[PDB]
Amino acid sequence: QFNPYGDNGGTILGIAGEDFAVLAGDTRNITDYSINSRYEPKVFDCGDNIVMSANGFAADGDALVKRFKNSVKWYHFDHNDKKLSINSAARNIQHLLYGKRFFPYYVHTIIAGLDEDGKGAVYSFDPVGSYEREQCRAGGAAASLIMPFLDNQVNFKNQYEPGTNGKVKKPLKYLSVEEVIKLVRDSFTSATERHIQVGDGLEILIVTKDGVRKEFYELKRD
Amino acid sequence: TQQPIVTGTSVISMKYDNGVIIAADNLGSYGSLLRFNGVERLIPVGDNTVVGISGDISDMQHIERLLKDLVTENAYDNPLADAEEALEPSYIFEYLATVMYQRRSKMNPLWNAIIVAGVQSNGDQFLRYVNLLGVTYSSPTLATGFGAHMANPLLRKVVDRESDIPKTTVQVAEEAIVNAMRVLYYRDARSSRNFSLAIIDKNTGLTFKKNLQVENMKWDFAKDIKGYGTQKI
Amino acid sequence: MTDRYSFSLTTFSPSGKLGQIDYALTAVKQGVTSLGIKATNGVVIATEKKSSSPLAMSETLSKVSLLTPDIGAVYSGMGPDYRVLVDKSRKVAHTSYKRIYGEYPPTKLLVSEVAKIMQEATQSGGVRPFGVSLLIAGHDEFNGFSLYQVDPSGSYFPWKATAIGKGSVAAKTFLEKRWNDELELEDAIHIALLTLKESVEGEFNGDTIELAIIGDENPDLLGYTGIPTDKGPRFRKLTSQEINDRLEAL
Amino acid sequence: TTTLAFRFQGGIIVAVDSRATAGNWVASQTVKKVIEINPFLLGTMAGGSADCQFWETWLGSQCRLHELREKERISVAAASKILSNLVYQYKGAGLSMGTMICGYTRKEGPTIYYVDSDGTRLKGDIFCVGSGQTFAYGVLDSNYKWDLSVEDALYLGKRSILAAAHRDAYSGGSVNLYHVTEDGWIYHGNHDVGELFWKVKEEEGSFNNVIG
Amino acid sequence: GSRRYDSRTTIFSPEGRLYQVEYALESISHAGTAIGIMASDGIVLAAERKVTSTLLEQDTSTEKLYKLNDKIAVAVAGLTADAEILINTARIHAQNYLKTYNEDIPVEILVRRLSDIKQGYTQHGGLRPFGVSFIYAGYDDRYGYQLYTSNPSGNYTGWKAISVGANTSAAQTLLQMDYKDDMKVDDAIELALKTLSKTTDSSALTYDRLEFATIRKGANDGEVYQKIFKPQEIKDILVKTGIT
Amino acid sequence: GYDRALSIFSPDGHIFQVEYALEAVKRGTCAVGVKGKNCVVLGCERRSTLKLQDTRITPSKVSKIDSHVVLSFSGLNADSRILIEKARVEAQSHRLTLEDPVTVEYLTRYVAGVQQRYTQSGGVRPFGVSTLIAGFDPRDDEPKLYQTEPSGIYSSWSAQTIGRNSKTVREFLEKNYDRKEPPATVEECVKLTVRSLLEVVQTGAKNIEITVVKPDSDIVALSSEEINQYVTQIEQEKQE
Amino acid sequence: DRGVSTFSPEGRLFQVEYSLEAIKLGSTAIGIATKEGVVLGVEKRATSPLLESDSIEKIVEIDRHIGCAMSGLTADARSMIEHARTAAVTHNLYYDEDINVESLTQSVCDLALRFGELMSRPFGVALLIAGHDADDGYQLFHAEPSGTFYRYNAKAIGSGSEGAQAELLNEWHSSLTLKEAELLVLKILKQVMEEKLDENNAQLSCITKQDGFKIYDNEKTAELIKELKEKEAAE
Amino acid sequence: NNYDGDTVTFSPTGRLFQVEYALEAIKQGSVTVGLRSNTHAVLVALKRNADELSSYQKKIIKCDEHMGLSLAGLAPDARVLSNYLRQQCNYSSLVFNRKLAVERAGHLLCDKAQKNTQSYGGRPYGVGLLIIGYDKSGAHLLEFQPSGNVTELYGTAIGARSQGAKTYLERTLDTFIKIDGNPDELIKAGVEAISQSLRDESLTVDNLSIAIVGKDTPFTIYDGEAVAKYI
């Protein structure tokens, strides 16, 4: 019997800062126990200061990103070159995904950018289109390894202030772009060590009011 | 949904400093029966692209006709069909990739794994993969089926990352490909000794080599091997 | 393309006339004379084989046609329109009756089906009415022998005897004097030949006259033996010789 | 999931949890399981996240179109039936929903409809829906009265979700409270279970089984 | 294109009349007269065949009176072929109703259905209307004995006594004069034949130029019998009433 | 299918087919609607050119669309059946989905919408019918009376008439109907409706039909004798 | 006869030009756009005194931020309004935002030329579409049955249009207040109307960013009419 | 005369009058100019207002990052045709990862317009288009007529009084073709060209509409104070 789905591995990570947002993802592409590519870009600039990644089955991932990029193009044509806000993009993606509710895009989608107040924004989707704005989200193969670390080191969960013994929580102070990139790199270094489908390279896209910047880092190739 | 009947095995390929090399054996298998011994699985498109195909041969022949038809269609009302508006490797690939994914989405796939090797207008090397699922990826070395498991490891020792491409000559690259084909003949039970090889260079163009054979094989050591353990005679 | 004539080409005029039906009847009037006579033990239908050229083989053109083993038809008017009606009539006898009830339709119901086809050409989009009047003779178990006329409008009437086409007015008067309710089939054939001679100009023989009967069952024409209940067709077309024999006793 | 809604003297109380799971994996603790269909209508969400989200924000579009066309607020009966008729068309296809449509109008008063992906549409006073519905039912049925204050009703709903959050492994995170009166719904805050449990335990004297 | 040849059968005149309906009614006015008379104990249907011949087989002939079911019959005035199309549709409608509700179709419901079909041909489709007017004679257990008429417009009305076809103006005046509410079937039979005898364009009214039918509760106990009169039976009733 | 554009604009900006449909309404028997303080009355003319009619079974001029709404009309009778049927279906469809019967305004808006659709659809001619739709909204004691016409426009009326000689009876209603004080009772409302028809009808015998609709699905049709008593009382006051 | 989509020798579609004549026979509708809002006003024109004038609905809400006035064969407008309302709500569903007034107008105008031998004829009604969005602020559009739409600072359509347009030419400036615009619509309506203008035979409405689209009460308009009379008698 | 009732009818001299009447609608439209060098291609369009309260009707539509057109005639027909071009440009990109050639875009418009001239029921398009673009063979300018005829040109003009601008370009041919690597000078030549078609009215800030595409210049439209530089 023909199986229309496959698993291309990989892992992605979105973090929303105070006036910035990052969307990271490893560059390894796989099937079963073989490496297809050590550098296959997974996070894409879609225009209008929005970055996107659809992790899971790469064919469905590429199809979805391609169709969203297309939706941005036609949004400009149909509405006098109006900038597609991140919240509007998110709702649009829900309809793209739910449109194939009974033959789903087998992907975990994450977009990142800035909201209309200039603050950092990350949105997260399931394969059939349910979505929610989030401060933090890891997706894909090693998501289970990364999310708990982010609950602890981004939202200061289960952390309290010394001397008070559980009475006073650690205050939720804001994180700089340099601080976030440190947490992203350590997340992927750790994920690479314990997950076989994570490695080769890490590509991070950073979104600010100035535009979209890229950073690349080597990961272990075993 | 179907099953593949007459099938072709590994297609292997890699980038080098001035272009790309691609190769595939000339066998059309019918299960374990090595039925057809003269099947060409590298199909050139113009003088700048070679499409290597593995998997179902009936579907390969269909794809071959689509590409032939693509050249005809591009020539229509196109005074620059042999110049600025000639078919690019990137155009040919994206077309195939579109078809492969559309067919899988109708639950009626073209049961193949395809590698499009070529050189672009600006001299850039093109090498990208697509299969029955519509999955696509690019890499300095690409291989299908058994080639993925056995050829890639050997070809990645020559070009391990992007920066190794300018350091790799056509002689070193071809040598690596020819060696990989020998290894696949040792170890793939659905391979043949006879194969075809294609080089697409940005300077010397398309060189298509037919009727190549695996040579310099090591078998002599077999004479010393006796029994499966304790047997001496 | 597409048939963009989805509207009626036959419409009521201020006077209440349906023009195309009237004009179709005019075409029937110009057509060669045909007639039908009903006897106690049979029915006869007859017409003239008006050959368009002496080089033409008039035997290949059949004006009198078998519809079922016990039903036959003849016409006056446009031959091609008749030919396609016979094709449709033969088919409808199977599709709307024989494939349902396992037997051939009775005369009146097959006539009803033909009439329906001719009515629809009078109301449907983008078509003209059929330019023929049919005379349908037939037999069935419960109704016995019968003879029907069918007009371009789709209207049909049962007749003891009648004529249509060129010299119908004179021929119907001739039949009124000769017809009675005690005629045997041979007597009806004799009267049919007498009536038809009046409307014919040139040669009058078996080769220029087409004549068929609905009479006794013909087991010799069945084609097989072994089933007692199947006794053969009541429709029989008279041969050129059989006509000439009765022209000597004329 | 644990979601509840109940009619009383002061209108309707709606209370939901916040957890979303994929197997044993906790996918989210911050899910909005209540949707604000308009200033007067609320919908709860249980079962498939996408199905509930998509079709309940769709419901808000249909309700808006109704009051544009009819120059009048849509009834809770009519709104709930639009959703139930829609999902009934998709019956068999595999939609997964358990929802309460909660509202207040002049002609109806406070009204709750349980709507279901099998096509079930039920009017009622009390409903609990989700994997932890049985736990919430225990607290509700023993403490429910018509003559509850808005303050006491709000607490009962909060406490009933807490009860389920504790016992049901697929419920938890936090509690979202809503209070529905004539003049629209009124949000009553997000309450983290990690803090609410220790607060309620201490103040109420309950959960003596657990050590704190 | 094709527009050039379109007669446009479904349009209003400047006066607000439907051309084709009006012309269809003109066609019907030349058809043989049909009369229906409703009594307390039954209904009569009488109709005149159009200029017949001595060679017409009358006993197997039917151009005027048709059976829709065991309880309902119709008299036709207009194109016979058009009428048979509608008659077969009506026969099916009656059977559909019987299959659905397991009860015989009420007369009015059948009449409304056929009338609605006629109406459709005047409003849409670009086809010519049916050049037919019906007299419906029927019985059901709600309203009892009922007479209706419908015409190409698709409009229908109920009657105590009514005529369609030729000379309706003269016929309706004669019926209006001699009709009474407490009338019986035997009296209605006589009235129908006397009316035709005076309005006919023929020299004399004979059995071979008539079709006749009665719907009576003159069936053994609480039930209804349809009687399509045979040629010999029409001849006898003509002698009985003193016309021949 | 037959796609021919029958309703089209003319150089002076008129759709003649729609206007000729109004002429068919002008030909139709007169229909009148009057709303009182707690009721609506629908009066209808019956042309006495047709006697020997069976009034038991003959299609009545006023039709119930639901138990709380009625519809009368002027124009082509056969056309009116199609609108009535559609309206009755929509009335049940509304109860099924909204769980509440139609408002008189909604039902009118639907019927008017159907009539409009037939003025710019290919292959069809407009309805030769104008309607008066009357009744009471569910759980509402305010009387409702609406009018529609072939073009598809509709509007609410304190009192209105349509059909032949409607110009005359509208003249009567415009001077006799006071908005500040409408017919307070059923009697007063019926009397004013009969009076208005008597300006046009001829004989007050079987030529006038009256249907009274009251709140909460209370609809009744008056008999010949009941109407005849109104006819008698009106003329006896007139002899002065 | 002749095609419905036929061109005249001058290069105009016969049917579109004829539908414009029908719009000239329609009741007057006026729109004025300001920086404080857009005002929409219409002549009701009841055919008889027995017709309850408050049932005449020639000003209509499309969304909270978009209103619409009509003139001509007003029955034709119902399907245009239905489409407009659906388009507005649908876009909010797909994009979680208000739709641009221009985009809404464009969507309505796409229906216009969908006629042939689709609907059998063009629409016999013109629309004044007024609204507000964040990108282009307060806007007023004139949507015709030709499929064309122009933006306007002020615009009059219907029987008294060219007389009203000439009056709007003189009176409009870029610093008009909302109150000044309200009176200006009432003034020009009163000028071109056959019958004497009052709160029962004329209707006002506006669209502001804060309160959205509002149809004015007959009591509220009556005061603005009284305010108008006094200020005209003031000189 | 008797042969202008529909598009499916030739006249006795072999003319299609409905097509010619559609051509007439273009001549009533406002003037627009197109011209190109080897590096850039420019559109200049005189926009038309209804009155002083009204806006000026937009004349230029973007089809892709590398292609767009200006219109003259029925604006809704230009919207239909530009929408078709947007889809065809987009199909080329999605399927073949290839920017649509300007010549091939012209061929597609020709064939779409032709079908409306040979079939019953339909009508010809009532608009003329000037398509500019930059593809793999450099800058291009096309002129589309609703008869179906598409023509590649160095420069041209369509609309009312377009003959004046067309003559100017015919004189300036050798000059403006050489304006390479200088967008502002190529626009100046276009603004000077369209000025030969003006009478009574002159180019104001909300009257003028300019568009440009080139080697390293995406198709961009200039309106309002962005064109005050060129007035």
Ligand SMILES: *[B]([O])([O])[C]([C][C]([C])[C])[N]C(=O)[C]([C]C1=[C][C]=[C][C]=[C]1)[N]C(=O)C1=[C]N=[C][C]=N1
């Ligand atoms: B609740 O537990 O039913 C919850 C409500 C939903 C609206 C968020 N549903 C889920 O958590 C479901 C799984 C499930 C668990 C128990 C019962 C029924 C269903 N999960 C999701 O819908 C889901 C999971 N991962 C990502 C997105 N959505």
Ligand SMILES: [Mg+2]
């Ligand atoms: Mg690893």
